[PDB]
Every structure is written in structure tokens, then in C-alpha cells.
Design an enzyme around this catalytic site. Structure first.
Site, PDB file in Angstrom:
ATOM      1  N   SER A  88     -11.005  11.799  -3.825  1.00 51.02           N
ATOM      2  CA  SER A  88     -10.540  11.371  -2.510  1.00 51.02           C
ATOM      3  C   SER A  88      -9.037  11.129  -2.551  1.00 51.02           C
ATOM      4  O   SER A  88      -8.426  11.130  -3.624  1.00 51.02           O
ATOM      5  CB  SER A  88     -11.248  10.081  -2.090  1.00 51.02           C
ATOM      6  N   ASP A 144      -5.786   8.713  -0.484  1.00 50.13           N
ATOM      7  CA  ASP A 144      -5.454   7.664   0.478  1.00 50.13           C
ATOM      8  C   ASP A 144      -4.242   8.161   1.257  1.00 50.13           C
ATOM      9  O   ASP A 144      -3.294   8.672   0.668  1.00 50.13           O
ATOM     10  CB  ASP A 144      -5.113   6.352  -0.234  1.00 50.13           C
ATOM     11  N   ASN A 156      -6.923   9.999  -5.647  1.00 52.22           N
ATOM     12  CA  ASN A 156      -7.763   9.182  -6.506  1.00 52.22           C
ATOM     13  C   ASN A 156      -8.509  10.089  -7.476  1.00 52.22           C
ATOM     14  O   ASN A 156      -8.619  11.293  -7.253  1.00 52.22           O
ATOM     15  CB  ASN A 156      -8.744   8.364  -5.665  1.00 52.22           C
ATOM     16  N   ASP A 190     -15.322  -3.727   8.982  1.00 51.41           N
ATOM     17  CA  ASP A 190     -16.443  -3.091   8.295  1.00 51.41           C
ATOM     18  C   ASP A 190     -17.198  -3.951   7.287  1.00 51.41           C
ATOM     19  O   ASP A 190     -17.907  -3.420   6.424  1.00 51.41           O
ATOM     20  CB  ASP A 190     -15.957  -1.794   7.624  1.00 51.41           C
ATOM     21  N   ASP A 238     -11.590  10.129  -8.001  1.00 54.39           N
ATOM     22  CA  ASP A 238     -12.931  10.423  -7.508  1.00 54.39           C
ATOM     23  C   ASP A 238     -12.953  11.620  -6.559  1.00 54.39           C
ATOM     24  O   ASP A 238     -13.998  11.963  -6.007  1.00 54.39           O
ATOM     25  CB  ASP A 238     -13.518   9.183  -6.820  1.00 54.39           C
ATOM     26  N   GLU A 287       0.843  -1.188   0.000  1.00 54.29           N
ATOM     27  CA  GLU A 287       0.000   0.000   0.000  1.00 54.29           C
ATOM     28  C   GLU A 287       0.887   1.251   0.000  1.00 54.29           C
ATOM     29  O   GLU A 287       0.641   2.198  -0.748  1.00 54.29           O
ATOM     30  CB  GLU A 287      -0.911   0.043   1.237  1.00 54.29           C
ATOM     31  N   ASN A 300      -8.501   5.861   3.076  1.00 52.54           N
ATOM     32  CA  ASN A 300      -9.260   6.762   2.203  1.00 52.54           C
ATOM     33  C   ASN A 300     -10.060   7.881   2.873  1.00 52.54           C
ATOM     34  O   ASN A 300     -10.812   7.652   3.818  1.00 52.54           O
ATOM     35  CB  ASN A 300     -10.183   5.910   1.320  1.00 52.54           C
TER      36      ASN A 300
END
Length: 129
Positions: A50, A52, A46, A101, A48, A35, A59
Site C-alpha cells: 500500500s 500513503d 509501505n 472510524d 505491505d 505525517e 492509505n
């Protein structure tokens, strides 16, 4: 900060990640390696809107607030910047919520692509834990 492989393993075991939710330490060290390559300052924007953040690339759309992500939720209740510290505590506590989650470690795409189903024990080799 850039953690050595065993130095990170130790830090994670110290924060209760070994076997957490049934995921051996190797899994966590492997996820961190792919990662962010053990870099606590790692950030990936990202498409979109967002971003990380940190060693486990958490995120901004749902877990932390960076004040620039549309319709974002701050489920971990922390600024994304705290996830870029040399102290992984924040990232670990947030990660503990993410892994629980409903998707297990599949939440981390790098873990899924490079760690899932492999001999993750190798990531702990040479470590005196």
C-alpha cells in the site's frame, strides 16, 4: 504544494476541522506536520503493498484507489491521486471519515507518536484565525 504552518491551519479551519470529533485544530496541524511536513505531494510506500498519500498520508489499502493495492477498498470513493492536489478538500473530507472510524486520531501513527498528549495548541501560535 508546501503549506506554511498558519496557511494550513487557516485552510483546515475553513474545512471544518477545528474541534471536529473533539479534536482541536492544533491536533490536525500537528498530524499534518509529522505525517507529511505540510507537503501535499508527500507519498510513502509501505512494505505491505500500500501507499500513503498527501498532506495527511491517507492509505491506499482502504481509503483510496491507486489501482495497485491488493484487496484494496475505496471507502472514500476517490483516486489516491486526488489526495496529492494543492487543494486539501479531498484529503479533509476523507480524513473526516477516517477519524470517525472507531480509533479517533490514533489512525495517524505520526499523530499518535508526536502529537497525542502534548500541548498541541502551540501549532496554532502566531496564526490569525
Amino acid at each position: 504544494k508546501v503549506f506554511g504552518r498558519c496557511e494550513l491551519a487557516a485552510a483546515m479551519k475553513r474545512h471544518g476541522l477545528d474541534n471536529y470529533r473533539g479534536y482541536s485544530l492544533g491536533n490536525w496541524v500537528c498530524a499534518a506536520k509529522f505525517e507529511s511536513n505540510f507537503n501535499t505531494q508527500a507519498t510513502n510506500r509501505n512494505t505491505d503493498g500500500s501507499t500513503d498519500y498527501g498532506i495527511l498520508q491517507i492509505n491506499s489499502r482502504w481509503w483510496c484507489n491507486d489501482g495497485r493495492t491488493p484487496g484494496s477498498r475505496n471507502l472514500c470513493n476517490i483516486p489516491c491521486s486526488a489526495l496529492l492536489s494543492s487543494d486539501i478538500t479531498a484529503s479533509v473530507n476523507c480524513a473526516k471519515k477516517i477519524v470517525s472510524d472507531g480509533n479517533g486520531m490514533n489512525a495517524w501513527v505520526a499523530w499518535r507518536n508526536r502529537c497525542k498528549g502534548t500541548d498541541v495548541q502551540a501549532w496554532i501560535r502566531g496564526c490569525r484565525l
